[PDB]
Write a structure and sequence with these properties.
The structure is cut from a larger assembly and holds chains A (about 475 residues), B (about 450 residues) and C (about 110 residues).
Chain A: H1 61-67, H2 78-93, E1 98-104, H3 110-126, E2 133-139, H4 148-157, H5 164-177, E3 185-191, H6 202-210, E4 218-224, H7 229-233, H8 236-242, E5 245-249, H9 254-264, E6 271-276, E7 282-284, E8 287-294, H10 296-309, H11 313-335, E9 342-345, H12 347-358, H13 362-367, H14 371-386, E10 392-393, H15 394-407, H16 412-423, H17 438-447, E11 451-453, E12 463-466, H18 470-477
Parallel strand pairs in A: 1-4, 1-5, 2-3, 3-4, 8-9
Antiparallel strand pairs in A: 6-7, 6-8, 10-12, 11-12
Helix pairs in contact in A: 1-11, 2-3, 4-5, 9-10, 10-11, 10-12, 11-12, 14-15, 14-18
Chain B: H1 11-20, E1 31-36, H2 42-52, E2 58-61, H3 69-87, H4 104-115, E3 125-132, H5 144-149, E4 161-169, H6 172-176, E5 185-188, H7 193-209, H8 212-220, H9 223-243, H10 247-262, H11 267-270, H12 273-279, H13 296-310, H14 353-363, H15 380-391, E6 395-397, E7 412-414, H16 418-427, H17 434-437
Parallel strand pairs in B: 1-4, 1-5, 2-3, 3-4
Antiparallel strand pairs in B: 6-7
Chain C: H1 2-13, H2 17-29, H3 34-43, H4 45-54, H5 59-63, H6 68-83, H7 91-105
Helix pairs in contact in C: 2-4, 6-7
Classes of the chains: A alpha/beta (about 475), B alpha/beta (about 450), C mainly alpha (about 110).
The complex binds adenosine-5'-triphosphate (2 copies) and magnesium ion (MG) (2 copies).
One adenosine-5'-triphosphate binds near residues 74, 112 and 314 of chain A.
The structure holds one DNA strand of 41 nucleotides.
GO molecular function, one term (chain A): chromatin binding
Function (chain A): Component of the origin recognition complex (ORC) that binds origins of replication. It has a role in both chromosomal replication and mating type transcriptional silencing. Binds to the ARS consensus sequence (ACS) of origins of replication.
Keywords (chain A): ATP-binding, DNA replication, DNA-binding, Magnesium, Metal-binding, Nucleotide-binding, Nucleus, Phosphoprotein
Chain lengths: ~475, ~450, ~110
DNA sequence: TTTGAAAAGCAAGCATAAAAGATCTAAACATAAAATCTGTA
């Protein structure tokens, strides 16, 4: 058979098609799923990434501060912890089904406190105060396809691998018809729910609908970045019909961020260290004893700057880590140390680490361009000063460049550079319609994002706009000693 | 360590080719561009350079035959495998299917799998992948060439076989889209009239002097090369303003006018070049590069559609109205002052069906006449002829697909030039110029 | 020197060392002996020839390759485009301008 | 034979329809591996 096209790289998973409604003859024929070694979960790739080191690492006194300010390593989230914990505990002890929607901006401690509530629930179930439950964590931004959540959750429930539609019918039949005495309670963390709802609202409506079933024994914790995601993905009738718990996560204040930072630094500040003077390795208590500190006002202004802009813990922790890294860079450069009295992280280190975030490189990039690129930007600024359109044709820029060269003939620099600009300093080269490196600087300003150019194959009538603002361009061209006097 | 051949007006290009293309991969760029317009000798110079250096391993691909990006990737994988197993026949290799390459990443993976089985070679070699006509690809988005610039970065740097890309492109603006990549580029500027004449003489004199018609003409009744060269310069002097500096167009004109020039060669003309030019002077005044049945209702409908497209609809009563009035009234006075732009130089205007049928009725040719009513009405033959004119695209609409013929929003316009409608009107002896003489 | 002149020229136009390397490479590679290489680095005449080649297919070098009929049609089209309000023209208007132009010359 | 005067013409300015197409979606058309269902054995 002669084919019209070929698909030669099809890789298909060995996933079955038959849903759970056909695994048994009747609803009364289903055994105890808790007493089954494939149900409810009743990582071999670590040794791939393993090797042996030859030389010992020199662990500098600041590397403790850097390692201990990582996001991988619950002050201020007590009402949220209490609310999620009492909703989940009350629904678990009553063998009911509930759903808690948690919203907020990134980095405010949403996933962390939901996980801490879940571990506290697991510890209480270890003391047999509440019945046992399965914990499933489903992240919408960790998927190839949004329907794979259906494949994931059922695989955590039954242990078998199905396709997503059959998994959806299996989960529907599990939460609807399977009796409560033959099943276990399930707590689902639906993180990044906006990643799974972009195409359509099937996953949102299915997961919220399963908690309305009397047989479900299902706890769904759904975490998102906007508050009106259920109100705009489902109607108000549906959201009134489910009745989810609604919890917002406001950004941290500066005092809360400060307590977070020095609770990360509780055992390290104002502490002693035995430091090897020839290598720089430090051991927490030929050897010098060095005290280490971070000042209070540095953390204070860092947490004050973060709480004004974003209020998230990740930025505050990362500027503290960057300040410690800057201090350790200067320390290692001063003492000549390698990789294999009082040491302080100062206010100026936090200032510099914040200034790398605060400042922009647009003006600095534009002041170090060539004369032709600055000529292009100056001609563009002259054109938007004259006709006031904010989009200029490229031919108008060419004519404005030609006019600026022709007018300033008495200037020493323009007289010295015009032969370069229109003949590349050579008498065998004819006078060109464009300047030398015209398309080079046009492509460079388009690649940098300074410019925007429309898609048009006529090079004269094609339009170009500044993609930054007019004031950084004015500040850049007034820095140049050539452009600012003409 | 390389040979620089002689190409007659491409000495600088050959020196740049010798400076860039080498068998040592350490001193060879990853990408090389040869940019020039049509007939500038890019293919000729590259072929001469690679045939002067037979130790250089080159694979020739013409991307005008592949059309899309996926056949180009498949052709790269297939031709690289073929060149390697006819270059190293004592190296056992797994023949990978080129049809499995459906992505650029799949090309990277397949080329890596092809190149790892040639690690037993002694020295590092170069594979020259000549993409002769990259911008002759028919689809040709902007982002495709960026995939081919950065292709060498994803391949192992310490491999025995290193792929080198040589691109040939036509348009300057396509090249200037990628100016910041700083790829080495050799330009092939267009030849002048002297260079075109010398190239045409050196490429066509041996074929013209050994043609069958000339040796039939010398039996029917150095100097053969002289008369072939003289014909080539006569063709150039007659037709350089028309062809420009095109080698191909002048080659077609030489091929068209050679037998008609041979057929007028006599004994008095073979040793007299000016008299032989005057004997066949008709071949040099005209280029003659060309290849040189509608109904009467279709013809008059085309004429009426041209009239509707190029006369504004507020003066038709000043031209076509002729019938005696029982009721007092005035017709249109006519246009007051003439326009000074010929409207047939511009695009046609749009009209409705009933205006076309009214003007068609006006311009169609004409006691027993009491029951005659001698005026042709638009019956089904007129509408069938009009629909046939639309499906032949001598009439056009404002929309082209899923056309609503019966909607009043859809308008019609003529789709023929003035010469076609002029010879159509002279086919039916209609004075179409009389409707345009007084208007401009 | 000529080398400092070309480096200054690159600094003011391109400010790109790879651009300069793309010109220096065939200056070195086309030298046949040591004295030729020293003469080539003294003069940098090859850099001028390279710069002339790099501009040979822009709108200037393409203009000098045209025939007189091609140039006449281009000038006629430019005249119609300059007189037009939107700069648009077609073949008929350009031919009319060309034929009245040849008539006024003759 | 005039005449005059209302129909016709024309143009500047402006609100709006509409042409051309950029962008996108969905249906028809097409393939393909794993699972699942059928017919004998
Ligand atoms: N209250 C807190 N106490 C201590 N550390 C915290 C606190 N809140 C956040 N962090 C730190 O900041 C990190 C970010 O928190 P988390 O991952 O819970 O944020 P999130 O609100 O879920 O963010 P996103 O929307 O980006 O997923 C945590 O991993 C932790 O290191
Ligand atoms: N320098 C030359 N010496 C001799 N013949 C030449 C020369 N340049 C071109 N020709 C002749 O003209 C023909 C056209 O040249 P060629 O096909 O190499 O041009 P090109 O620039 O690659 O064209 P295209 O853009 O159409 O692919 C050649 O096949 C050859 O016969
Ligand atoms: Mg999170
Ligand atoms: Mg070619």
């Amino acid at each position: 058979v002669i084919r019209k096209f070929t698909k030669k790289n099809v890789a298909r998973a060995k996933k079955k098609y038959t849903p759970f409604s056909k695994r048994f003859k009747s609803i009364a024929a289903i055994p105890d799923l808790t007493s089954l070694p494939e149900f409810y979960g009743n990582s071999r790739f670590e040794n791939k990434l393993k090797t042996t080191q030859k030389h010992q690492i020199v662990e500098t006194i600041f590397s403790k501060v850097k390692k201990q300010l990582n996001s991988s390593y619950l002050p201020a989230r007590e009402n949220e912890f209490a609310s999620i914990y009492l909703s989940a505990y009350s629904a678990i002890e009553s063998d009911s089904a509930t759903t808690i929607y948690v919203a907020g901006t990134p980095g405010v401690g949403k996933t962390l406190t939901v996980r801490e509530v879940v571990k506290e629930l697991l510890s209480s179930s270890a003391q047999r105060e509440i019945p046992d439950f399965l914990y499933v964590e489903i992240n919408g931004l960790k998927m190839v396809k949004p329907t794979d959540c259906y494949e994931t959750l059922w695989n955590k429930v039954s242990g078998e691998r199905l396709t997503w539609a059959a998994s959806m019918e299996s989960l529907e039949f599990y939460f609807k018809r399977v009796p409560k005495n033959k099943k276990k309670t399930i707590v689902v963390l639906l993180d990044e729910l906006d990643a799974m709802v972009t195409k359509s609202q099937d996953i949102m409506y299915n997961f919220f609908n399963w908690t309305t079933y009397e047989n479900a024994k299902l706890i769904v914790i759904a975490v998102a970045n906007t508050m009106d995601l259920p109100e705009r993905q489902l109607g108000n009738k549906i959201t009134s019909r489910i009745g989810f718990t609604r919890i917002m996560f406001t950004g941290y204040t500066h005092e809360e961020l400060k307590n977070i930072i020095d609770l990360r630094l509780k055992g390290l500040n104002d502490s002693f260290f035995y430091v090897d003077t020839k290598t720089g390795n430090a051991i927490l208590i030929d050897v010098r004893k060095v005290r280490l500190r971070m000042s209070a006002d540095a953390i204070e202004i860092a947490s004050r700057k973060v709480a004004s802009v974003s209020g998230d813990a990740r930025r505050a922790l990362k500027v503290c880590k960057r300040a410690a890294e800057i201090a350790e860079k200067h320390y290692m450069a001063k003492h000549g140390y390698g990789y294999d009295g009082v040491q302080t992280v100062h206010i100026t280190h936090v200032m510099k680490a914040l200034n790398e975030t605060l400042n922009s490189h647009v003006i600095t990039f534009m002041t170090r361009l060539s004369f032709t690129a600055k000529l292009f930007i100056y001609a563009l600024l002259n054109l938007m000063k004259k006709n006031g359109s904010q989009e200029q044709e490229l031919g108008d820029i060419v004519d404005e460049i030609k006019l600026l060269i022709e007018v300033n003939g008495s200037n020493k620099f323009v007289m010295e550079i015009a032969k370069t600009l229109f003949q590349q300093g050579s008498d065998n080269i004819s006078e060109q319609l464009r300047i030398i490196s015209w398309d080079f600087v046009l492509n460079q300003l388009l690649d940098a994002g300074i410019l925007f150019k429309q898609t048009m194959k006529n090079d004269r009538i094609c339009c170009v706009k500044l993609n930054i603002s007019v004031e950084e361009a004015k500040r850049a061209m007034n820095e140049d000693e050539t452009l600012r006097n003409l | 360590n390389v040979t620089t051949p002689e190409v007659a007006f491409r000495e600088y290009q050959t020196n740049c080719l010798a400076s860039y293309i080498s068998a040592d991969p350490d001193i060879t760029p990853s990408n090389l561009i040869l940019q020039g317009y049509s007939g500038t000798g890019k293919t000729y110079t590259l072929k001469k350079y690679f045939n002067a250096n037979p130790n250089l391993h080159a694979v020739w691909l013409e991307p005008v035959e592949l059309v899309s990006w996926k056949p180009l990737l498949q052709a790269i994988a297939r031709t690289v495998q073929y060149k390697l197993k006819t270059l190293y026949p004592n190296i056992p290799t797994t023949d990978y299917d080129p049809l499995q390459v459906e992505e650029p990443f799949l090309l990277v993976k397949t080329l890596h799998n092809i190149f790892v089985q040639y690690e037993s070679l002694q020295e590092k070699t170069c594979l020259f992948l000549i993409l002769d006509g990259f911008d002759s690809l028919q689809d040709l988005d902007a982002a495709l060439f960026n995939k081919y610039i950065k292709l060498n970065e994803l391949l192992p740097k310490d491999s025995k076989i290193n792929i080198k890309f040589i691109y040939t492109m036509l348009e300057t603006s396509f090249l200037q889209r990628y100016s910041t990549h700083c790829i080495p580029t050799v330009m092939f500027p267009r030849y002048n009239v002297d260079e075109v004449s010398t190239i045409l003489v050196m490429s066509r004199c041996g074929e013209l002097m050994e043609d069958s018609c000339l040796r039939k003409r010398i039996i029917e009744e150095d100097q053969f090369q002289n008369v072939a060269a003289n014909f080539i310069h006569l063709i150039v002097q007659a037709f350089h303003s028309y062809t420009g500096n095109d080698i191909f167009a002048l080659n077609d004109l030489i091929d068209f006018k050679w037998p008609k020039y041979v057929s007028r060669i006599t004994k008095e003309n073979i040793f007299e070049p000016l008299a032989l030019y005057k004997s066949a002077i008709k071949l040099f005044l005209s280029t003659d590069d060309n290849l040189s049945d509608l109904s009467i209702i279709s013809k008059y409908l085309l004429i009426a559609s041209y009239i509707c497209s190029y006369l504004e609809p507020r003066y038709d009563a000043s031209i076509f109205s002729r019938k005696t009035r029982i009721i007092q009234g005035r017709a249109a006075y006519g246009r007051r002052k003439k326009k000074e732009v010929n409207p047939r130089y511009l695009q046609p205007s749009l009209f409705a069906i009933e205006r076309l049928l009214a003007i068609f009725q006006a311009i169609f040719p004409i006691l027993s006449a009491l029951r005659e009513e001698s005026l042709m009405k638009a019956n089904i033959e007129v509408f069938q002829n009009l629909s046939e004119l639309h499906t032949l695209k001598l009439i056009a609409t404002t929309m082209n697909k899923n056309i609503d013929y019966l909607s009043p929003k859809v308008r019609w316009k003529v789709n023929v030039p003035w010469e076609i409608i002029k010879e159509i009107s002279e086919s039916v002896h209609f004075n179409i110029s009389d409707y345009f003489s007084d208007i401009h | 020197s000529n080398l400092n002149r070309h480096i200054r020229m690159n600094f003011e136009t391109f400010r790109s060392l790879p651009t300069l390397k793309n010109s220096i490479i065939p200056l070195v590679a086309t030298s046949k002996n040591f004295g030729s290489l020293c003469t080539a680095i003294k003069s940098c005449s090859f850099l001028d020839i390279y710069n002339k080649n790099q501009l040979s297919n822009n709108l200037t070098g393409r203009l000098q390759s045209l025939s007189d009929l091609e140039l006449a049609i281009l000038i006629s089209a430019a005249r119609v485009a300059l007189r037009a309000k939107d700069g648009s023209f077609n073949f008929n208007l350009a031919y009319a301008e060309y034929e009245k132009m040849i008539k006024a010359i003759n």
